[PDB]
Amino acid sequence: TVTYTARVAKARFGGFSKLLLLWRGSIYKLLWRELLCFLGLFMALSAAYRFVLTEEQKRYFEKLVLYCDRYASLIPVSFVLGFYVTLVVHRWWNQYLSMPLTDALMCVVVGTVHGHDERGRLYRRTLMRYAGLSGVLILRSVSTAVFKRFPTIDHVVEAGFMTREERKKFENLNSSYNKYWVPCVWFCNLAAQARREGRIRDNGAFKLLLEELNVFRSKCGMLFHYDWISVPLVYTQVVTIAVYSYFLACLIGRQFLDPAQGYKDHDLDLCVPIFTLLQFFFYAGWLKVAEQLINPFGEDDDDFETNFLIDRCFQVSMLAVDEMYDDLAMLEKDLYWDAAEARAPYTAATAFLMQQPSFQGSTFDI
Amino acid sequence: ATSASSHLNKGIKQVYMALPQGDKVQAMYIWIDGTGEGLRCKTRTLDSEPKCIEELPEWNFDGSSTFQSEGSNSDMYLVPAAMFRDPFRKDPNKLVFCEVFKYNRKPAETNLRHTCKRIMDMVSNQRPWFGMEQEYTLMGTDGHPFGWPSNGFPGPQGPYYCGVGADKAYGRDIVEAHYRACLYAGIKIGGTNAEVMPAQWEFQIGPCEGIDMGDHLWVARFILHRVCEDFGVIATFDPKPIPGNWNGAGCHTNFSTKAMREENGLKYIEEAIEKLSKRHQYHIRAYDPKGGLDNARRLTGFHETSNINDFSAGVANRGASIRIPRTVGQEKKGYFEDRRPSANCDPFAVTEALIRTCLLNETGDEPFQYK
Ligand SMILES: [Ca+2]
Ligand SMILES: [Cl-]
Numbered sequence A: 001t002v003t004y005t006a007r008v009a010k011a012r013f014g015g016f017s018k019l020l021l022l023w024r025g026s027i028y029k030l031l032w033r034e035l036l037c038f039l040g041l042f043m044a045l046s047a048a049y050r051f052v053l054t055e056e057q058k059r060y061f062e063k064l065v066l067y068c069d070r071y072a073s074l075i076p077v078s079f080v081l082g083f084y085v086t087l088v089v090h091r092w093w094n095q096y097l098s099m100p101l102t103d104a105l106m107c108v109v110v111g112t113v114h115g116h117d118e119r120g121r122l123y124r125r126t127l128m129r130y131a132g133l134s135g136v137l138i139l140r141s142v143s144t145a146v147f148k149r150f151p152t153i154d155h156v157v158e159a160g161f162m163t164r165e166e167r168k169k170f171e172n173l174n175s176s177y178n179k180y181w182v183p184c185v186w187f188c189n190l191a192a193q194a195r196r197e198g199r200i201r202d203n204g205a206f207k208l209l210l211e212e213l214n215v216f217r218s219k220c221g222m223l224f225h226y227d228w229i230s231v232p233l234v235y236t237q238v239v240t241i242a243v244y245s246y247f248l249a250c251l252i253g254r255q256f257l258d259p260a261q262g263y264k265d266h267d268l269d270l271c272v273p274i275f276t277l278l279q280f281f282f283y284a285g286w287l288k289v290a291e292q293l294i295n296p297f298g299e300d301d302d303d304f305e306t307n308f309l310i311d312r313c314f315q316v317s318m319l320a321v322d323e324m325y326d327d328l329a330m331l332e333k334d335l336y337w338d339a340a341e342a343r344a345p346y347t348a349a350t351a352f353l354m355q356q357p358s359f360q361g362s363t364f365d366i
Numbered sequence B: 001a002t003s004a005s006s007h008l009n010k011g012i013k014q015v016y017m018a019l020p021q022g023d024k025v026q027a028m029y030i031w032i033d034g035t036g037e038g039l040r041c042k043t044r045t046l047d048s049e050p051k052c053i054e055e056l057p058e059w060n061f062d063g064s065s066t067f068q069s070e071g072s073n074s075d076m077y078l079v080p081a082a083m084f085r086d087p088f089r090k091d092p093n094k095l096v097f098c099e100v101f102k103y104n105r106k107p108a109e110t111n112l113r114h115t116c117k118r119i120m121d122m123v124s125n126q127r128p129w130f131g132m133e134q135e136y137t138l139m140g141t142d143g144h145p146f147g148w149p150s151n152g153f154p155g156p157q158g159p160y161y162c163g164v165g166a167d168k169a170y171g172r173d174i175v176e177a178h179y180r181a182c183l184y185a186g187i188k189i190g191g192t193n194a195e196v197m198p199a200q201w202e203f204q205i206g207p208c209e210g211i212d213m214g215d216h217l218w219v220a221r222f223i224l225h226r227v228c229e230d231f232g233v234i235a236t237f238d239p240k241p242i243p244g245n246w247n248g249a250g251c252h253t254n255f256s257t258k259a260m261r262e263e264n265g266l267k268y269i270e271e272a273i274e275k276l277s278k279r280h281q282y283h284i285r286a287y288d289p290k291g292g293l294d295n296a297r298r299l300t301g302f303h304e305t306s307n308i309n310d311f312s313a314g315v316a317n318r319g320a321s322i323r324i325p326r327t328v329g330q331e332k333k334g335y336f337e338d339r340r341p342s343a344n345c346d347p348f349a350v351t352e353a354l355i356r357t358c359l360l361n362e363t364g365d366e367p368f369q370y371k
């Protein structure tokens, strides 16, 4: 992922303009090869027209240039691009929201699975490790970077996510389908065992744990669904054909004709179609947005950082359920115990922007 | 006949025990008194649930009231050694088993854990495992066994061992309550049975590693006394509560090391036993709180016991001083059972003697200093 929200915190004079100077995850890094290809074909065709072609053939070539320029439609391709890219962006954001995150699970576990002893600590750590393991399994199924990090289940075992005995139980299961759901079933069994053993004190807490487990598992299933069910291939081919047809039309129809013929709208030759190159940037980059977001778990610069999320979730969940279990500072009175109003101070840098009348409603200025 | 306290309405107490106690936590400090066989306890309030034994403060008591000191400097100190969940008060309340120290911070005379822990740390790599079969007899407040006819005897022994029915098992309610109370507390209780003597019972503690054997058995004894106090009966660990053709109570100790548990560990079992063969008198003195006089009434060689004056070992020998189980002989590995220790033995003394003789190759009539 390429984060630039710090740069665009305000609508400045040169806000979006300086974003064109970035390289990592930029339009240039995605297009420059197609840009050089389009420029190469355009320059080769222009050179052939200027030198190689006969005078007789040049009249036919320029008539074909006029014909190809008449059918260069830039408006209709904008519709198919807008709709297709909007669908791809919707899928991309929903895919990000489906990342297996264990924050809800860690909060429930640390608040419901009890015991300062070795067994309670084993319960909490193993409950969160099961969710981490199912996250790792689904992500290595869907993400190329995680797969290269965990090429085999042996890599998962050496990483500490799954144990030797859990590995034997995992491989002995007779199923031809992806087994990312297995640690979730293990989580359900372990939660039921903890409730039976009294580690979970109340019936509500067990229900809350299974509700939060099914939310986590549904996110894993949703990542599998997005991975399996692509954007329909026919629609992707339609947008690609529209864009490539328009650019093939622009390659010939926008060729610089000899001004000596005096054809209208073609009485100039700048030997570089800079406005056609700007249109190429526009439409080719608009397609490149979808081409980068269509599978957001690849190795694009703007693709999701799945390995970082795995590491963060594992470390934070272990910290929260093990070192932070029932480890609280003693209850004491805050700065505003005796104060009628509870208001924090402002720094010298924020006071002169703040201290303004508080909004009470639209109807109170009558 | 049960005690006057047992006749107080238990319903009432429960009603008070059902009150939510709030943020304060009760800790019951348990220690061994000056007889080396009696347990004492008292309770303090803590601000919060202790996460480990390290968070428990040291405490103190008057040693002149526990047969443990005399004169001016009778204040003794309690140092927490092992923590357990309180089965009488429930979570988050704790049972705190403590070592006893004199006013000058020297170990108390009945503090055998202090030396026992040092010996266990010396052989930690060999990982010694222990198990103890604690036999006990339930008694009425009149000093007669629980359930026996008034000033009389039940039928002869034969049907009571592992018996079921109103005429076979006496005071099983206490046994069930104790078993559960120990499981809740985190005591390593391995099982129970009705013994050959009616109103006599047994619970197994183990396997426990090193110093954990003494902590688990002593706290298991405390819970039994406290559970029996609720029912208004007495648990006695007297090695021979009733004279005649009525079984004694022993504390059979199972011992194994990492070498003995491994394949072909029988050779190490036999080496340990032949070392024990040469120190029978040293172990008899250690296996009894008063030097072996109590166990003289039990070790008569008649009622599935051995002779106190003679040492013997064998495979599947119930009458021997040391027994190698038949399965251990067949599998050529496992443990051996020391059947000598009395029911009122100190487990710290018993475990320390086994390690000194079998693992540290100690000889003579006195324990080695610093080794
Ligand atoms: Ca991508
Ligand atoms: Cl008390």
Ligand SMILES: [Mn+2]
Residues within 6 Å of the ligand: B133, B135, B195, B202
């Ligand atoms: Mn027995």
Ligand SMILES: [Mn+2]
Residues within 6 Å of the ligand: B133, B252, B337
């Ligand atoms: Mn036995």
